[PDB]
């Protein structure tokens, strides 16, 4: 039911050939989208029959550079706009048409009736109608501060006007079913949302987007959190305090706040806190901890020095690992952040006077065993056939994913194979390996055993054909169980067919 979103924006997919597949994996069977629902750079043919289940988007809905005419987001009731496109808009619809004409024609957001924070930006798309027919301030929440709306009607077609059955001639479509239902501006008592004109028809104070009845069970969407079908303001805390002394005792009614729903325990690859929350980055003056059975938590901390990757501390704005900053990972056995290798890395920049990065400097990462964020590689030294410097890397969490989708990204590399012999799991997100001319031993890795949730998979294309690998004799050594291996020889096997010999198999 609940699924991660994305964070690409106007940035253009490197593998258009698999781009749609990623979205299907992300949004198939998904009712609530944690983070942003980004739909970008789709063709006319494209079937989006997976988006039909989507109901909430805690992020910001972006529909940009799409030659499709239909985007079925009928069931979408609420956009919380926790994050905003350009920090100002909760819904952005940009450049959908131009070089049967192509482009978005109807928005058909017939169930959207709530935008808690953030405005609406619609511009640059000719086929679109029913963009100025909608009363946006009824969908905008009462306390919503960001109530900005910049819309562009500039078109190249005629708009068949709303059904006469659409009160106020306010509609998403010509159809009788696409009439905009109001649930704020037409209420009395002043109560934010209602299902009728009288105050006795007001929705409970803890509902959002409307309701079917007075009580808090009846809400179309909960404004704050969902307490097993009820909408509470906070979830029940895990701690109760002795009336007299204030001795913290755990109460059995306690629930962690994941997204906008109270949960007994967090989902996988998510951190439980003493503050009664599920999160991906731990609060300040806090350290990450592992449990008896691997369960990662978050204890308060004197707090130990630790290795920050990209998207953390000073490496928040840093684009990728470079010669100027490669030295920091010295001895790091775990980087708290993302590792992103770019052409500019090994090429260097003379305008900053950051020299090139030599292939021996990558030796540093021999120590490194876990990455909280993600590993992205669109560059490498052609010197190296494989990823040996990351032979030690046991797990990529992907708590921060690249473009919000991909844990592991390998594109445009002159390398023979991988060799991540230690890589036993990928915590969250999808694997994007493409346009790697020489890459073999790809179908040899059992990626079905590196993934943890079904929204995950590997997306490969423009590699070296396995037909060629087998033909040039590049396959798994006979001492690698079920021929699962990361590269050539017994120095790569996953499970050894017979007993160890340290590095090598025998």
């Amino acid at each position, epitope marked *: 039911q609940v699924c991660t979103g994305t964070d690409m924006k106007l940035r253009l997919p490197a593998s258009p050939e698999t781009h749609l597949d990623m979205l299907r994996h992300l949004y198939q069977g998904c009712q609530v989208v944690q983070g942003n629902l980004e739909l970008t750079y789709l063709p006319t043919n494209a079937s989006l029959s997976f988006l039909q289940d989507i109901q909430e988007v805690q992020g910001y809905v972006l529909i940009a550079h799409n030659q499709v005419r239909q985007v079925p987001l009928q069931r979408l009731r609420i956009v919380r706009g926790t994050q905003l496109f350009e920090d100002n808009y909760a819904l952005a619809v940009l450049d959908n048409g131009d070089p049967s004409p192509g482009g978005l024609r109807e928005l058909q957001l017939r169930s959207l009736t709530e935008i808690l924070k953030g405005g609406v930006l619609i511009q640059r798309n000719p086929q679109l109608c029913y963009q100025d027919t909608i009363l946006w301030k009824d969908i905008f929440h009462k306390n919503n501060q960001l109530a900005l709306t910049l819309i562009d009607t500039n078109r190249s077609r005629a708009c068949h006007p709303c059904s006469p059955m659409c*009160k106020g001639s306010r509609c998403w479509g010509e159809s009788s079913e696409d009439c905009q239902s*109001l649930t*704020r*501006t*037409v209420c*009395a*008592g*002043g109560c934010a949302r209602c299902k*009728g*004109p009288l105050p006795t028809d007001c929705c409970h104070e803890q509902c959002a987007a409307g309701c079917t009845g007075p009580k808090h069970s009846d809400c179309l969407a909960c404004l704050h959190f969902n307490h097993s079908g009820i909408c509470e303001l906070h979830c029940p805390a895990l701690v109760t305090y002795n009336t007299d002394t204030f001795e913290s005792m755990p109460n059995p009614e306690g629930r962690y706040t994941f997204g906008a729903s109270c949960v007994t325990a967090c989902p996988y690859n998510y951190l439980s806190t003493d503050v009664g929350s599920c999160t991906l980055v731990c609060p300040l003056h806090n350290q990450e901890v592992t449990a008896e059975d691997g369960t990662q938590r978050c204890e308060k901390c004197p707090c130990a020095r630790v290795c920050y990757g990209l998207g953390m501390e000073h490496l928040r704005e840093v684009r990728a690992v470079t010669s100027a900053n490669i030295q920091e990972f010295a001895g790091c056995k775990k980087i708290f952040g993302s590792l992103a290798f770019l052409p500019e890395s090994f090429d260097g920049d003379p305008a900053s006077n950051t020299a090139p990065l030599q292939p021996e400097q990558l030796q540093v990462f021999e120590t490194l065993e876990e990455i909280t964020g993600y590993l992205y590689i669109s560059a490498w030294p052609d010197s190296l056939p494989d990823l040996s410097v990351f032979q030690n890397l046991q797990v990529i969490r992907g708590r921060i994913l690249h473009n919000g989708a991909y844990s592991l990204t390998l594109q445009g590399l002159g390398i023979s194979w991988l060799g991540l012999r230690s890589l036993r799991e990928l915590g969250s997100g999808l694997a994007l390996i493409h346009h790697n001319t020489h890459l073999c031993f790809v179908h040899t890795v059992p990626w079905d055993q590196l993934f943890r949730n079904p929204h995950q998979a590997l997306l490969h294309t423009a590699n070296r054909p396995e037909d060629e690998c087998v033909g040039e004799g590049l396959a798994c050594h006979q001492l690698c169980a079920r021929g699962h291996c990361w590269g050539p020889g017994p120095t790569q096997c996953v499970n050894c067919s017979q007993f160890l010999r340290g590095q090598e198999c025998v």
Partner: nanobody
Amino acid sequence: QLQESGGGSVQAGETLRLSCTASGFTFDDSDMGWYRQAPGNECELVSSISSDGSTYYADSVKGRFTISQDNAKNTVYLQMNSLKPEDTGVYYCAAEGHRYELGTCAALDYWGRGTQVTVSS
């Protein structure tokens, strides 16, 4: 649940009685009021009565329209005498207390409230 009754086609100069019926409530300490919206013209407050029976009207209706809140049957009446075609439109009753946001006429139009008035000559 408030409903409007008493509309119809009539020749001008005739009379109509309008009923603002309820399904629960008490209008006590909550002065009621009739509104009306003519085709492609602004929503107007035609008449309103206090909790104590101190009536108000607009300049076009006074001496022709008399408003009155029955306590027993718990229904608000609006007697419209000396009807003119300039009157024609849809008349919505609604507590001046429980006032909407998108506009009284506009909101009650959404929920399908009020009753239709038609006047020829």
